[PDB]
Design a protein around this nucleic acid. Structure first.
Ligand SMILES: Nc1nc2c(ncn2[C@@H]2O[C@H](COP(=O)(O)OP(=O)(O)OP(=O)(O)O)[C@@H](O)[C@H]2O)c(=O)[nH]1
Lengths: 440, 238, 246, 634, 135
RNA sequence: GGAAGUCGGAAUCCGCUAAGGACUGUGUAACAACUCACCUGCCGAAUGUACUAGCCCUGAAAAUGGAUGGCGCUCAAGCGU
RNA sequence: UAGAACAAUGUAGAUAAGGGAAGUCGGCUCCGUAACUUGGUACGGACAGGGGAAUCUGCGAGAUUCCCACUGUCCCUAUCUACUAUCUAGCGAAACCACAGCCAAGGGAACGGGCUUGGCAAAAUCAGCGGGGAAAGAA
RNA sequence: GUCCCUACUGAUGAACUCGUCGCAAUGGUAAUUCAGCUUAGUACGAGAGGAACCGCUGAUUCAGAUAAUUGGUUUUUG
């Protein structure tokens, strides 16, 4: 679902203040030298132990709240590795774990010391020693706490990407028209600014087509470089392109308005195709308003056609400024994703043994329609006022009066009193509001 | 939302219509609020606040002096790291299974002796409360000292030894107790008190002698009170 | 015309409402949102009555009837009968019946032509239903569920039955009823079709948790929202159903 | 309330073969009557446990027998018992005693001993909970020869009569592993203290927990612990594969096994089946969750967990053995309890802590020369336990596809799974979890159980952990499983290069650096940047080797020795006399007074007079006459 | 979300904690055993109890062995202890009976044996659908 | 990728000068823009940094309702001579 | 020793008389006949039942529904035993008693009851009584 | 191996001629928590999801009464 529920991580000083205040205010703090040595020992060992389990509980919460990189989906694992340096993540988490262990050991040793103490002064010193040594440990674990706070905040703000669902990976060279399509297709607020790397992360929007929900993932932008000398945000994009079963929509820019060349765009798409090994590749000539495809150099036309003549990589056309064909490309790609997934689902349901699966037969039962053999229909008593009726619209000025409006005008929800005799159709209209005799 | 949506909302709609004025008024009121806090709030919270403001003013004065100087103008970690990496690599590689089991402790030995002897003389036991160092895991003590009990929770085996000239503190094993200048009996039993001469292993430091030789043990004066501070701190006598 | 509504915050519409070709019964409670939705979809074309049955809001599961008549259980009191009679025109016969199975809306499903009843009703009740409704009454269980009133919604244009009805049961039921039947779900996987929906020849009111694919199925089966909605839509655009309810 | 009210019912099954530190029938030479009885029973040839044990018991040696349930341990210790007793004794005092965990096991022992001693005059008594303490009094008055009892009831009657057990010479502990798991240790020790030293001790079990080993060392005189040989060498006809699986993909991986790696037919099947899949899990909550998930997926699955009802377990096991269910999911303890027939398919869902437990769960199959398959799902956290399993089996580890044709039967081969379908299965699991709320609640329960079980599970070894880290670093962890196919190896590799070289990226700067926190992160990076045969084989001494407390029936805490006196009040009730002291002849009048019923034992025993007849009541005279009959019967 | 019904009026509670109950649905259990009551208020030594239409947590004591010894939420539909309805009618049922229900309010079974309390039918719409007799 | 004084590392100069830092903060994706440092005009006379010495506040408090002896006392009925 | 008021109590201990509750491992083969080596083998029959409460159809093969376990466990109900008692007429002790008897702070000697300074403070009784007027001595 | 004094608190009470109607120094002090409807599937949100103020109706505990009704107790020995 997300990682917004990870508790805030305090700094070193805030952590020490929290733990040493809880032990100050949640336990009694008055013992006297004229009391028994056993009770003095009990008081101080109670203080030390309480501080220990407080620190242990906070560290355990830190260790168990943060998601484990191992058990995540590969997309999320690589995304967090790029965004957070999983190496440093694991290092900081290990420091927290080791500090927890050492605090536990310090508490045990000083509990033994307090058992074998014989003076109130000595017990006080040993208690102050224990609490002081632990505080040194937290002060040392200053910086990992800051790193964990920052990673927690970014993780809580990170978008929810569903790894295995109908998804459209919107990708291409920078300033091609990626955000401009994503905003036109979904309700995602993805800045459409005319500068270069405007988008510095992955944006996600949601769509409805033929009563099905679709995901659209806008990627930042990829340059023409080998995948080894490659910048962090645009490796976030390549990870999105590499670990998502999806339809990749690669935007092509016929004009040189993007800031790059056609040949460079072709080279980049050829370089990224190995990751688009089997994902459904649709290249759409964005910005077909300025320079249409017909007004283009014949050898470049033939290169685009050669690019068509490979697998099931196909090219469409749309202008994300003249609201011209973004609708059409949307329906085309969504329908083909639908047909591919239904084909895969029916193949999966039909096993080699030939036995139809339970889910497949349930779908067949839900999709079959039953009709009477006689082929005779039944009469419908629909009144003519239905066909001569007018749709109610809440924005209309001269609507019907309506019960919500009358109750809001004549009171509220527990204030309006409804007259149940207003709809009483009688012989004489004045006979309503008449009290019925019941017993004689 | 999915990204830096607070800055997004700030860039699209801005701040509250009096955020800047509110902040300026709060900043201006900070001085009066600080004096009010320093003169009114009371009980461990004053103590904390005072100790803080002391640190802050010392920091501010140091920063001002450093800035004035620079505007007018126009190792122990290394040695400790070497020692710790040497130990770490030795432990990581050169570790092979070998028998090592500790003998049962003096407390249950005493309990067994009590099971063997019905009549308990009053105060026949006296546990040694000061921290001790023993060495061998199991040893049968002579009849003379067979009645001092040294608890495991009080037994120590390592000490933080400070070398002054090669200014560095290293955790080193304790070899033997040479003299405790408070009680000969404490010296014999291994009682570890303040100002106490102990023999400490100085293998990891790498001290070169007049004959060019490498030191493996030296005298160290324990200079703290291990009975109050749950640790042993000594200074090498070199 | 398919719409979504809740009584107070509950998705079960058929429990609190009963819709037919000539009248609408609405449970009386707190606000007027439910009544307002029903009237905005039926702008005085047929009478709509704020009624309580046996002092309850489950009038939908306690009342059974069609365009030609209405039946109430013996527990319903004379003032409630007077309210119903005064709100409903004379072209609708109202009668109170002494059935052992008081949940008439749970034991009887009736369109203007046929009725399917719980197999344990009495003989007197069977032909009194045949008299008041003027329909053919058959005893049958759907999906081995004996509460046809809660497990099936029926109209003169179609019928929605339990999602786990067999093909043999479904085509047998289609043969007897005379209208097409499709096994579908209402309110995101709920099996109580009758308890989660009221539907007539030109209106359906389901809960707010009813998903878009099953709402489209409902419209197609009951031939609603003009368009086409024969059920041939369900057969043709099967991709949505196989993807959503796989 | 009662979710984890006490503890996970299947706790653990600890085994200690270091307890090895203890040290035809006519050809065996039994009596003619016993021979005819065995021939009637149909035991034509003794089972291996019988062949190894009964001669020793006849040689009068205390023995501990490691044998599976259904191996015939019951007859194994009953036949020597009957051979030793061979007659009813006129002297008062029994000499045969067996302690069994549950009433069902006790009744099974009763049936066995009756069928094996048809004709011989031995008197055998059952002493289990739920029966009348007065009836047990009467049976002890009948003076049996063989006692078959549950220990708690045994102590109850022991305290109540202050019985003399000095005549007992033959003592048997049946399923002492279950006895100690259910918690009978202290009262068993008190029984042992009561028993005379001059006795022959038999102890039959499937496992040897350390507590049981200590108990045997305390109470047995030179135990010749026994065992078989299928309890050591994993049948070479067992072929094993190990699958690196993720926590969120665990259930999806289990179904890919069932679907694409096993070809498991769906629906009710048309003596086990050809497929015969058992699934070994960690706790009963995983048992229920996996059972319901499989059933929704369409799989003919029977579930057996620890604290399941007797009738339910019987029905499920009977279905599995008759082949009506083809999948059977058990934890460890339910598996040990149930007699499992020959299996072809074993799936280890949660990895076992002990390699010996793994050996048992995989010796569950591949028997009598018939080939067996063992698929085990392993996670990164269980990888150290996998390496401990490697050390125990002495086999070589093949990670991914380091070898072109690894022999899965003799090599421990670990690999991943078809990413394509693995994902189409994990999506299905996510969908069903989002749809069915009961499955979601079960999944949350098993998540909590996973946390608790990980917390309470025994630790691994340091070298195993270190080399587990090394394997995780190594490439062999992440590629497909050799099974799939070399062509797959081709296509996976077609892109695996770029995919792996993306996964292995070291960021230059974090997004936070892309303030004081930024300076702290930069300092953190600056601080934690990366750090810059010859021996004689003949004689080389190597390193590796070559008021006491007891719980009562009510459950309320009760003192060990609490003579309520109700036995003396029983005596007063039925005006009896002094009991026959040990040695004195059985007293036939008392035997006739309290001997036994006429066979079948009903439970429904209330004779209550009907209420007084009322004149206004319809059946006035009839009620009057039945009331009169009732007062006549009195 | 805690299964405490809203809008429930005062009525006499006659089924305390640890109470044996008949089972009214076709789920495979014959009796239930109330151990806890949702929405109860812990007083000094006061035993919680529930009336018709109140959710409790029950453990099955007899029935289908597969479901035996399992714990489920339940809502009670019939109460032998007399109580008064706001029309001034004091009434009681022949036994104590409830139905197994998930925390949202959906029944595991498909039918209810015998009548159903009016309060339960009003509070839980699913029971009104699965009910044949309402009194 | 972009980094123009202000995400970072190191140096940190000259001219015009009245004076202006290869910049003290705000701000942009980068600019831009504002602001500080410093300087000028108006105003007009004493300021302002660090210490010291008195009195006062804080510098820690539990658990029946109470104590400069009490009432009460403020250019005292408190403090110093 | 006798009258008035209401008079059937409570506690404790024993007692198999019953109930509520807690725990569970609780609910759900034999006789006769036929061949074979004295014992088994096949065939035929019976078993793996009652008591109580009820419902529905016309006493009815009448049909249908519900309850029967133990525990060295607790509590409750039942029986027995003992002590249990306001006023009035008459008769009628004893223990104990320096004098007293309201509180809070202070009264260096873990000391207050009489002293300081403060709260206060109004006859004579009856009933209930749960606080005080009793305690150490120290290695 | 050591039935009295006073406190609490009702209930009485002589002196002011009895009685009726009142004032109020002083003392004590009381209410608590949760839920449901509307707001509203609204604000907010890519999605998943998801409030609050006004208004209205209940329930827990505590406290003070009460016996129409509905259960229970019988020396009413009816
Ligand atoms: N005329 C025209 N302008 C377009 C079209 N698509 C995008 N643009 C312009 O492109 C500029 C921004 O493009 P974005 O959509 O932000 O580009 P991007 O590919 O998402 O890359 P980023 O800049 O990193 O977000 C604006 O000036 C848009 O008007 C198009 O089809 N036609």
């Amino acid at each position: 679902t997300g990682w917004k529920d990870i508790p805030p991580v305090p700094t070193a000083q805030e952590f020490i203040d929290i733990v040493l205040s809880r032990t100050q205010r949640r336990l009694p703090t008055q013992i006297r030298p004229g009391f028994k040595i056993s009770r003095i020992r009990a008081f101080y060992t109670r203080k030390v132990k309480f501080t220990q389990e407080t620190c242990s509980e906070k560290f355990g919460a830190i260790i168990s709240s943060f998601p484990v990189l191992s058990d995540q989906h590969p997309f999320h694992r690589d995304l967090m590795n790029i965004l957070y340096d999983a190496d440093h993540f694991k290092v900081a988490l290990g420091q927290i774990s080791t500090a927890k262990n050492l605090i536990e050991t310090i508490s045990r040793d000083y509990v033994r010391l307090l058992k074998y103490a014989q003076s109130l002064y000595q017990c006080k010193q040993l208690k102050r020693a224990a609490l002081g040594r632990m505080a040194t440990l937290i002060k040392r674990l200053k910086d990992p706490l800051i790193y964990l706070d920052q990673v927690r905040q970014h993780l809580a703000r990170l978008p929810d990407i569903n790894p295995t669902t109908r998804t459209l990976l919107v990708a291409g060279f920078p300033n091609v028209g990626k955000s401009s399509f994503v905003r036109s297709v979904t309700r995602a607020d993805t800045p459409v600014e005319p500068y270069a790397f405007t988008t510095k992360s992955l944006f996600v929007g949601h769509l409805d087509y033929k009563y099905l929900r679709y995901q659209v993932i806008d990627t930042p932008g990829i340059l023409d470089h080998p995948l080894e000398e490659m910048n962090t945000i645009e490796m976030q994009s390549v990870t999105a392109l590499a670990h998502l079963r999806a339809a990749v929509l690669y935007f092509m820019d016929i004009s040189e308005q993007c800031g790059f060349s056609l040949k460079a765009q072709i080279n980049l798409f050829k370089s990224i195709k190995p990751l688009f090994a089997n994902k459904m590749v649709f290249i759409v000539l964005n910005k077909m308003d300025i320079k249409k495809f017909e007004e283009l150099d014949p050898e470049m036309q033939q290169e685009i056609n050669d690019l068509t003549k490979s697998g099931e990589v196909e090219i469409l056309r749309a202008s994300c400024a003249t609201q011209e064909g973004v609708q059409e490309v949307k329906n085309h790609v969504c329908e083909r994703l639908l047909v591919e997934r239904v084909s895969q689902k029916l193949k999966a349901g039909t096993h080699s043994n030939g036995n139809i699966g339970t889910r497949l037969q349930e779908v067949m039962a839900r999709i079959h329609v039953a009709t009477p053999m006689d082929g005779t229909t039944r009469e419908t008593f629909i009144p003519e006022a239905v066909k001569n009726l007018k749709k109610y619209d809440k924005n209309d000025p001269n609507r019907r009066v309506l019960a919500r409006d009358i109750e809001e005008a004549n009171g509220g929800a527990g204030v309006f009193n409804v007259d149940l005799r207003k709809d009483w159709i009688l012989e004489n209209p004045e006979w309503k509001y008449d009290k019925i005799p019941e017993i004689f | 939302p999915q990204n830096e949506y607070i800055e997004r909302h700030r860039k699209l709609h801005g701040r509250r219509l009096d955020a800047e004025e509110r902040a300026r008024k709060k900043a201006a009121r900070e001085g009066h609020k600080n004096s009010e806090n320093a003169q009114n709030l009371r009980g461990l919270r004053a103590k904390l606040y005072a100790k803080q403001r002391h640190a802050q003013k010392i920091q501010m004065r140091k920063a001002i002096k450093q800035h004035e100087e620079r505007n007018v103008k126009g190792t122990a970690k290394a040695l400790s790291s070497q020692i710790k990496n040497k130990r770490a690599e030795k432990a990581a590689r050169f570790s092979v299974p070998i028998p090592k089991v500790r003998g049962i402790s003096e407390e249950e030995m005493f309990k067994v002796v009590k099971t063997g002897k019905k009549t308990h003389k009053k105060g026949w036991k006296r546990i040694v409360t000061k921290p001790t160092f023993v060495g061998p895991d199991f040893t049968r003590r002579p009849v003379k000292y067979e009645r001092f009990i040294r608890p495991m929770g009080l037994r120590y085996k390592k000490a933080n030894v400070t070398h002054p000239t090669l200014n560095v503190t290293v955790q080193l094993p304790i070899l033997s107790v040479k003299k405790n200048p408070s009680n000969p009996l404490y010296t014999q039993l291994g009682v570890l008190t303040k100002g106490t001469i102990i023999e400490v292993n100085v293998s990891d430091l790498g001290i070169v002698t007049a004959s060019g030789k490498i030191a493996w043990g030296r005298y160290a004066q324990i200079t703290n009170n291990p009975e109050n501070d749950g640790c042993v701190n000594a200074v090498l006598l070199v | 015309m398919a719409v979504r509504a809740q009584f107070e915050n509950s998705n079960e519409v058929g429990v609190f409402a009963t819709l037919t070709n000539s009248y609408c019964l609405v449970a009386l409670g707190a606000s007027e949102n439910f009544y307002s939705v029903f009237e905005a979809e039926l702008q005085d074309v047929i009478p709509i009555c704020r009624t309580t049955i046996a002092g309850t809001r489950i009038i939908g599961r306690l009342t059974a009837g069609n365009r030609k008549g209405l039946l109430v259980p013996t527990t319903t009191t004379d003032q409630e009968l007077q309210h119903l009679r005064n709100s409903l025109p004379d072209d609708i016969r109202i009668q109170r019946i002494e059935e052992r199975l008081s949940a008439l809306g749970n034991v009887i499903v009736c369109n203007d032509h046929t009725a399917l009843i719980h197999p344990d009703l009495e003989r007197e009740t069977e032909e009194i239903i045949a008299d008041v409704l003027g329909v053919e009454v058959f005893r049958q269980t759907i999906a081995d569920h004996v509460l046809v009133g809660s497990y099936m919604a029926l109209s003169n244009q179609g019928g929605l039955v339990h999602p786990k009805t067999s093909i043999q049961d479904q085509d047998e039921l289609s043969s007897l009823l005379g209208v097409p039947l499709v096994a579908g779900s209402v309110n995101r996987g709920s099996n109580v079709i009758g308890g989660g929906m009221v539907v007539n020849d030109w209106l359906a009111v389901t809960g707010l948790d009813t998903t878009a694919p099953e709402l489209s199925v409902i419209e197609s089966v009951f031939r609603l929202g003009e368009g086409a909605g024969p059920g041939a839509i369900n057969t043709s655009m099967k991709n949505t159903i196989v993807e959503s309810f796989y | 309330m009662p979710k984890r009210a006490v503890s996970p019912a299947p706790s653990e099954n600890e085994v200690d073969i270091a307890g090895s530190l203890f040290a035809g029938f006519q050809a065996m030479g039994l009596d003619a009557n016993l021979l005819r009885a065995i021939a009637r029973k149909g035991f034509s040839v003794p089972t291996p446990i019988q062949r190894k044990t009964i001669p020793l018991i006849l040689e009068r040696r205390d023995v501990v027998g490691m044998a599976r349930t259904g191996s015939g341990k019951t007859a194994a210790f009953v036949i020597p018992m009957i051979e030793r007793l061979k007659a009813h004794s006129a002297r008062f005092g029994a000499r045969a005693l067996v302690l069994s965990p549950s009433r069902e096991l006790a009744l099974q022992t009763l049936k066995v001993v009756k069928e094996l001693g048809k004709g011989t005059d031995l008197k055998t008594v059952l002493l289990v909970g739920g029966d009348s303490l007065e009836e047990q009094f009467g049976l002890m008055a009948t003076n049996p020869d063989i006692i078959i009892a549950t220990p708690g009831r045994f102590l109850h009657l022991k305290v109540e009569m202050s019985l003399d057990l000095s005549s007992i010479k033959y003592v048997v502990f049946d399923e002492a592993d279950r006895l100690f798991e259910m918690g009978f240790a202290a009262q068993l020790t008190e029984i042992l203290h009561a028993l005379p030293p001059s006795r022959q001790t038999l102890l039959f079990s499937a496992t040897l927990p350390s507590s049981l080993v200590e108990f045997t060392r305390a109470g047995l005189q030179d135990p010749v612990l026994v065992r078989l040989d299928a309890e050591t060498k994993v049948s070479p006809d067992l072929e094993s594969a190990f699958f690196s699986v993720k926590s969120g993909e665990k259930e999806g991986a289990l179904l890919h096994i069932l679907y694409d790696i096993i070809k498991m037919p769906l629906g009710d099947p048309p003596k086990p089946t050809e497929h015969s899949t058992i699934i070994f899990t960690a706790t009963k909550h995983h048992v229920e969750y996996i059972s319901n998930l499989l059933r929704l997926a369409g799989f003919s699955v029977s579930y057996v967990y620890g604290s399941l009802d007797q009738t339910a377990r019987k029905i499920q096991v009977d279905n599995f053995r008759r082949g009506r269910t083809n999948i059977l999911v058990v934890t460890d303890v339910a598996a040990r309890g149930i007699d499992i027939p020959v299996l072809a398919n074993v799936i280890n869902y949660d990895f076992p802590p002990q390699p010996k437990i793994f050996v048992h769960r995989v010796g569950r199959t591949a028997r009598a020369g018939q080939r067996g398959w063992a698929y085990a799902l392993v996670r990164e956290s269980d990888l150290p336990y996998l390496l401990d399993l490697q050390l125990f089996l002495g086999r070589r580890l093949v990670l991914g596809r380091e070898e072109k044709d690894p022999s899965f039967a003799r090599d421990i081969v670990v690999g991943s799974l078809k990413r394509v379908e693995l994902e189409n299965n994990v999506e299905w699991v996510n969908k069903v979890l989002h749809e069915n709320e009961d499955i979601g609640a079960l999944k949350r329960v098993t998540a909590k159980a996973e946390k608790l079980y990980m917390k309470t599970r025994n630790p691994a070894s340091s070298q195993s952990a270190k080399r587990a880290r090394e394997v995780i670093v190594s490439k062999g962890w992440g590629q497909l499983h050799a099974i799939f196919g070399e062509e797959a190896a081709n296509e996976e590799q077609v892109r695996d290069n770029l995919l792996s070289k993306i996964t292995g990226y070291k960021p230059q700067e974090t997004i936070f650096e892309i303030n004081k926190a930024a300076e702290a992160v930069r300092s953190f990076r600056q601080r934690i940047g990366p750090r810059k045969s010859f021996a004689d084989p003949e004689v080389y001494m190597s390193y590796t080797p070559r008021v006491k407390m007891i719980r009562g029936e009510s459950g309320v805490k009760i003192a060990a020795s609490f003579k309520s006196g109700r036995f003396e009040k029983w005596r007063q009730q039925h005006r009896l006399g002094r009991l026959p002291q040990v040695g004195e002849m059985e007293k036939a009048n008392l035997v006739r007074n309290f001997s036994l019923p006429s066979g079948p034992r009903f439970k429904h025993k209330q004779m209550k007079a009907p209420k007084e007849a009322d004149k206004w009541r319809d059946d006035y005279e009839v009620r009057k006459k039945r009331v009169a009959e009732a007062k006549e019967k009195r | 979300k805690r299964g405490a019904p809203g809008g429930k009026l005062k009525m006499t509670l006659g089924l305390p904690v640890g109470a044996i109950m008949n089972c009214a649905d076709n789920s495979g259990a014959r009796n239930l055993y109330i151990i806890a009551v949702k929405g109860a208020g812990a007083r000094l030594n006061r035993l919680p109890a529930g009336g018709v239409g109140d959710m409790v947590m029950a453990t099955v004591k007899k029935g289908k062995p597969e479901l035996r010894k399992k714990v489920h939420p339940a809502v009670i539909v019939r109460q032998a202890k007399p109580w008064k309805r706001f029309d001034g009618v004091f009434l009681y049922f022949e036994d104590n009976a409830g139905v197994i229900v998930n925390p949202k309010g959906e029944m595991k079974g498909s039918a209810i044996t015998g009548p159903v309390g009016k309060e339960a039918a009003e509070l839980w719409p699913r029971i009104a659908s699965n009910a044949g007799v309402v009194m």
